[PDB]
Design a binder for these strands. Structure first.
Lengths: 87, 81, 135, 80
RNA sequence: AUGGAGAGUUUGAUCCUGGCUCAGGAUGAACGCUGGCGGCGUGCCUAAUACAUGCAAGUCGAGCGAACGGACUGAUGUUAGCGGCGGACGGGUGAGUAACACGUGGAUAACCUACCUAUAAGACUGGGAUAACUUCGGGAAACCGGAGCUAAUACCGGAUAAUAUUUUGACGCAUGGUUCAAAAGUGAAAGACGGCUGUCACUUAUAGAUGGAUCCGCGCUGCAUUAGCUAGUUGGUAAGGUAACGGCUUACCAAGGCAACGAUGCAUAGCCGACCUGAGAGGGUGAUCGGCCACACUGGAACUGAGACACGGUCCAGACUCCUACGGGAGGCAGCAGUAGGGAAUCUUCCGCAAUGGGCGAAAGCCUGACGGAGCAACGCCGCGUGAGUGAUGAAGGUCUUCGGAUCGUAAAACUCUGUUAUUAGGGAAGAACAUAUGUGUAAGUAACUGUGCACAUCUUGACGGUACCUAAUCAGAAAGCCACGGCUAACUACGUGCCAGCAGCCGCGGUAAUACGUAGGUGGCAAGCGUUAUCCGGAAUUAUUGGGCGUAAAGCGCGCGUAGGCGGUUUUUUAAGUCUGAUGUGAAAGCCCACGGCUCAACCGUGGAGGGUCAUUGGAAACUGGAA
């Protein structure tokens, strides 16, 4: 179904990722629905992550299901926490 | 060819085909009987119609026909009744 | 013309007829059909090796070769350089470029290529005319 | 939402419950810029065929009716 | 303001006109001569030719029956099977297609949608089989057919149940809408847990999200030496069937429908974002990346399925290729590699699921030729090299010579000097966030607990790979060639030949004193590249909208009458289609430009703007063009 996942945007051995809401059947670097934020795992020390809040909580309420590491990224901003608070 | 999943899928396809065609054959017999009883206004029109509406909705639940097709058959039968 | 005349009859530019037509055509042996390819070079077979007299202002015996290319096309090709080892049934590589004097020669045989030796005594300009670096 | 509306002229009323409406509009030339008149014929439905050849009428689109018609007659304003 | 260069060539000489050619930028390039390295990319454009051989789609024993098999009752496997889900995704190719295929903007009150999310209501009661297995036969395989048993969240019958259908009353044309009050008929599951319940299976209704479907305006190749095209054609009335409207199909009526605003036909072609070129207007193109479409040896068809009329599914026909005991059987690389063939031309029959994504599973995990990486190729872009400081522009040697010298030349020895590179010999990242498991609290729901969501911290793991990279020694040592030198156009002498051999893009050169041929010195242009060929734009104002002309250079029809069309005298009022000015929505992303940040710089990468439309809706203005009076 609808998945919040990462799209590779990096060169050889220098990956950059966008946090994107996309259909599961779509290709990894192909068709998408919405861009949510970015994820850079090769920055200085801590991997710098950028996430929007309004759209991210909008898609989660609509049934979008984060992958294993988008869950981590949404947790480091407390997004999964505030999603849990609104039961 | 002949991937293991594909070889099994042939067996379950004919198995489902045999079950499916028997059910719609029974439905289409009921539908034809129901509307032929309505045309000449026989004494048994009502439960034959009920027998047809029963079988039509049972197959629409089995995805033998689409749901919207069931209503056209059902709407046709009760309107003539 | 007037604007209305231009609207009804838009300007038509001239088509460009390209030199070396036989390099623009391919062949399909399966369908027995000619195709469009735009090849840099084509490979053929020498069906006749001889010498041609040049145009009137000049006077020199010029070597040439009748080449049937990969297509079913028979063209005449120049042989640059001094010495050549080509007789009949010699596979050659033919590029573009015509000879001004020779009427009916619109191509050049590439020296130093498949079944075509370079110039024996060439020492400056070895990219053209074939032949490797002496010593 | 809103379905598109066109105003044209009746050029054919030889078929029952169907008229042909000529909606003439303008299209400029891409290169020269002159506006050229071009016309498009629309086949429209009218159950009560009160439109007669020469009337300017009001046309609105709808779901496909027959192989060609996609429009209905909304308003007839001319007499001719 | 950021942007625009020409030159040669018709003549005894000239000015025009006019064609030809060259100097620039590019490419999925090929070829010739050379060739050190690294980082990013790219790499069958041809035969949608034929394919040897390996892999590219499986998973769930917590759905469940085993001859099961078997640690130790038997953990664990799936040997094999039933069942569920997946196989319609991902990957490939551009044959076909000139079409609502594609782009853009809309509409559907003519539409479907499994998984995912949320809300509710539930999940009652019975039955009969059959795989597997056993045992008989057949048949050369492929396989097929008899009996005898056995389960399931497999199948079937009843119960009950919606906004489901029929009949009832209370807008934008087909109408939509939610109340009513009757009738028929439509379901389901269990598994593994904890003290009745938790989780995740289910069924029915709704909505949401997602993915599809149809219709419409505009845009979108060439040919008129392709002018008339169609007969379900075009409209209507019924019926059928489609998720749905509709000649979609069939009967019956009428004769209709499209077309110089290019019907039809022929040829060609996947379309687009985008790329190349240009000052711009334009012109050419549709490799890699992304969106859409179509196709899977050729051609028809349906089944299963939410979704296929299905690349590694089924049936039939055909053409091939293979087996056969001759009766019969098997196959499809336009998946990744790879082979043969064609061609000028395009690569390894590699490693790994470590990351991202996908399928299945409660998860651990399994599969993944997607993908992440390695192998090859100067194929391209970028960056760094192959040495530097002093040192006689005098050695010796070439080449000329006016024999005096000049030039190669600070070039060389010669001393110092460095280690970018290279060699060896030690360290050595990031990409790693996890998931699960473990603990700790919190929230909801709980009789309570397990369990779930959330919050934290622990344990874990890397194909690349001992690879970037750094540090020590050591050596100028192992690392430059290609083309030009008549003018365009930077670079000239000597010798050989003698309209020969040959050169040449054009002007043209060569006939014993060629800066044009071949060679030698020197020079100049570039440089791990340099030239040639092939094709596009420019220069070309040489299709002139920007931006050309028709007296004699090419060009005014031999002349009228005239139809469509194009254009149209002055004033007032009105309108607002054009025109102008705003505001919304969209013109995906990636691309171009600008800025900023990260790779030691650059290429490259990532962010933020900008820009991009004959766009749609909606206000405002009224001079002009358009409409009305």
């Amino acid at each position: 179904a609808v998945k919040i996942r990462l799209t590779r945007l990096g060169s050889k051995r220098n990956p950059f990722y966008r946090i994107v809401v996309a259909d599961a059947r779509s290709p990894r670097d192909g068709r998408i629905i919405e861009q949510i934020g970015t994820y850079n795992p090769t920055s200085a020390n801590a991997p710098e992550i950028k996430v929007d809040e309004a759209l991210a909580l909008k898609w989660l309420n609509d049934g979008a299901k984060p992958t294993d590491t988008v869950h981590n990224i949404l947790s480091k901003e407390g997004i999964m926490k505030k999603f849990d608070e609104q039961k | 060819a002949n991937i293991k999943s594909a070889i099994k899928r042939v067996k379950t396809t004919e198995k489902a085909e045999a079950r499916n065609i028997s059910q719609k054959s029974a439905m289409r017999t009921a539908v034809k009987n129901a509307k032929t009883a309505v045309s000449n206004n026989a004494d048994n029109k009502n439960e034959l119609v009920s027998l047809a509406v029963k079988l039509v909705d049972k197959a629409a639940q089995s995805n033998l026909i689409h749901s919207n097709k069931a209503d056209r058959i059902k709407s046709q039968l009760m309107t003539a009744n | 013309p007037t604007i209305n005349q231009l609207v009804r009859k838009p300007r038509q530019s001239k088509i460009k007829k390209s030199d070396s037509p036989a390099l623009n055509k391919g062949f399909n042996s399966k369908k027995k059909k000619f195709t469009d390819l735009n090849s840099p070079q084509k490979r053929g077979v020498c069906t006749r090796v001889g010498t041609m007299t040049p145009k009137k202002p000049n006077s020199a015996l010029r070597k040439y070769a009748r080449v049937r290319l990969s297509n079913n096309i028979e063209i005449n090709a120049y042989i640059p350089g001094i010495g050549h080892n080509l007789q009949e049934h010699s596979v050659v590589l033919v590029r573009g470029g015509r000879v001004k004097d020779l009427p009916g020669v619109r191509y050049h045989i590439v020296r130093g290529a498949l079944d075509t030796s370079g110039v024996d005594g060439r020492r400056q300009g070895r990219s053209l005319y074939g032949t490797k670096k002496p010593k | 939402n809103d379905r598109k509306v066109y105003v044209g002229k009746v050029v054919s009323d030889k078929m029952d419950k169907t008229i042909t409406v000529l909606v003439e509009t303008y299209k400029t030339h891409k290169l020269y810029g002159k506006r050229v008149k071009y016309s498009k014929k629309y086949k429209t439905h009218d159950e009560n065929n009160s439109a007669k050849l020469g009337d300017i009428v009001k046309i609105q689109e709808t779901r496909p009716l027959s192989a060609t018609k996609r429009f209905r007659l909304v308003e007839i304003v001319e007499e001719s």
